[PDB]
Amino acid sequence: NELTWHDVLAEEKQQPYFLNTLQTVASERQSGVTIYPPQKDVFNAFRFTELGDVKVVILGQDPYHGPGQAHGLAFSVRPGIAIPPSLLNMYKELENTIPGFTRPNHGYLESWARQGVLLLNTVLTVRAGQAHSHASLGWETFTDKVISLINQHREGVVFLLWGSHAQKKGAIIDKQRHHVLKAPHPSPLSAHRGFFGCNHFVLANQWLEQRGETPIDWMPVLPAES
């Protein structure tokens, strides 16, 4: 029953707030301003991980306002861009927590995506070099819905909520229908004193096997094609 990203997203795509958002962005592009996640990538998060495969959920704010960075997935960057501060620290927690681990050489996380790790940003677009600029367009009300549906039609999903903004704030899920772990943002300004000791990655994997579901390989891999 009702099991795909057509879930409401068949109505939540017809809705005026959502339609207007798309256009207001469409215009801005065409108007001369270069908005960032290329229109082709904007929805990658739902493309690499279908509603039924969502095992873990990591919430991000908005995308990278720099050239060539963002590609539709939270935290992740393209195959050759400098690993960002917060993803850099995310690697630190893994390098220590997950004993099999060892650090990659890039911040491309499409691997985690295709293993069921939803890398969802709360606002989907941003203006070049202007952070949180599209924070008044409605992506949040679209993204809230998303989270609602997951909390409605799914069970046993792990939500990794980092930072007072992701955590709670805009994340009031059913504590028993799902597993909600909280911690401070991995940003250098707060990674230490709060984040670094949490074993979210390991814990998120301990609870899966516990349910029989296969664990997540948290080490980045690299394909491509052509």
Binding site: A82, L88, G163, H165, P188, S190
Partner: protein, 73 residues
Amino acid sequence: TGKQLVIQESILMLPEEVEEVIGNKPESDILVHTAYDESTDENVMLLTSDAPEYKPWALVIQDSNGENKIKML
């Protein structure tokens, strides 16, 4: 060589999250702009207010082991 202090990311934090580190409390939302550097293994952060103002609030320098050099702007 005079060139670019490349901000790599900008994290939005609530005032109470910042107070928790800085010791001072921002009268609004803050945007943590971070530039990395594997030369000195340093994290340069510029804390400014939410869009569209971006009014500089503080500057924080952090070293390889997490020590913070704070300065109010």
